[PDB]
Amino acid sequence: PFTADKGKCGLPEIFDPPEELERKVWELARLVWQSSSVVFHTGAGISTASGIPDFRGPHGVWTMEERGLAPKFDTTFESARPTQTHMALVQLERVGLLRFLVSQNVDGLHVRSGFPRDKLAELHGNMFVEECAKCKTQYVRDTVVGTMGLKATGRLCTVACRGELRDTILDWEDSLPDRDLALADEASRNADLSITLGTSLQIRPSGNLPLATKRRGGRLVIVNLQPTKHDRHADLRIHGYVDEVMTRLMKHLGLEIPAWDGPRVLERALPPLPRPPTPKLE
Numbered sequence: 001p002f003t004a005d006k007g008k009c010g011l012p013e014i015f016d017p018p019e020e021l022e023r024k025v026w027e028l029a030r031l032v033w034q035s036s037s038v039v040f041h042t043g044a045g046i047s048t049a050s051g052i053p054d055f056r057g058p059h060g061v062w063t064m065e066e067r068g069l070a071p072k073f074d075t076t077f078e079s080a081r082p083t084q085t086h087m088a089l090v091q092l093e094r095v096g097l098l099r100f101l102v103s104q105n106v107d108g109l110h111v112r113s114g115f116p117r118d119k120l121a122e123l124h125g126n127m128f129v130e131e132c133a134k135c136k137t138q139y140v141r142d143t144v145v146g147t148m149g150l151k152a153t154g155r156l157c158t159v160a161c162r163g164e165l166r167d168t169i170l171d172w173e174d175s176l177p178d179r180d181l182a183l184a185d186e187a188s189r190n191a192d193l194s195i196t197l198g199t200s201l202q203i204r205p206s207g208n209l210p211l212a213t214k215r216r217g218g219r220l221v222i223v224n225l226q227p228t229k230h231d232r233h234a235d236l237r238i239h240g241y242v243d244e245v246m247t248r249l250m251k252h253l254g255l256e257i258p259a260w261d262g263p264r265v266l267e268r269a270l271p272p273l274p275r276p277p278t279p280k281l282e
């Protein structure tokens, strides 16, 4: 806990000049159109524009701790709204352009955005989610489950069980959920495109999953304001706000960013909605 390595914190931000940003978001669109299997990896950087500080940003939880200062939350976890980027990822799964979504984020927001849980890996867990120790049944709650570290929340299982319910919030020592990690690992290896959004990729094994796509000729796009552990390995790096990149990308793909009806849980991905015909590339 005190000893835990929190990695490189507070590296300087990179801003791609606009001409270059526009050109890289078009090239990202090109790659989305050519890819059979797209997997998105997300970290704290996709929720900063909803008021949730990241970990290793200029005002990161870890960076501010390092400087003897406090992270600042502009929302509770319960009053946070999925960002343009969250709602862009909902649509890309709905139209068949997102195979799987791997997330380090415990903020609940991919679940609350209406993103289907059967295509989401929550590698570090979810604040709103508690799991029955006996039957492994997961409960998506409307408030944060009060504990962190895989402790008893004090509620019991209601499966037609009285099993101890526990939080899914891994402590520093805790191995990742075998199911989420197994499914994140498979999707990553099979992907011909892995796009990272607002993660520095500093945590093993989460941060290495995108690199798995590079085996057997897959492409890696890293979208981040700061440098990331695996920048060297990226076919494309885009230094800009994830909301600007995803809003420009959607525009290029001819998809609207859908309305957030408020907190809603989808367990299972639906059949793909219709999407625009693909452009002529070569």
Ligand SMILES: Nc1ncnc2c1ncn2[C@@H]1O[C@H](COP(=O)(O)OP(=O)(O)OC[C@H]2O[C@H](O)[C@H](O)[C@@H]2O)[C@@H](O)[C@H]1O
Binding pocket: 042, 043, 044, 045, 046, 048, 049, 054, 055, 056, 057, 060, 104, 105, 106, 124, 197, 198, 199, 200, 201, 202, 203, 223, 224, 225, 226, 227, 240, 241, 242, 243
């Ligand atoms: N609007 C933005 N647009 C683009 N990038 C952004 C934005 N805001 C922040 N970033 C970038 O987003 C990146 C976020 O990097 P980190 O803060 O390490 O988040 P993680 O999810 O990878 O942290 C992994 C685990 O570490 C912890 O121990 C927990 O267990 C976490 O789950 C930064 O490089 C920012 O520059």
Ligand SMILES: NC(=O)c1cccnc1
Binding pocket: 043, 044, 047, 052, 053, 054, 055, 061, 104, 105, 106, 107, 108
């Ligand atoms: N977005 C997140 O999941 C998160 C949670 C706690 C602290 N910083 C970020």
Ligand SMILES: [Zn+2]
Binding pocket: 132, 133, 134, 135, 136, 137, 157, 158, 159, 161, 162, 163
């Ligand atoms: Zn149970």
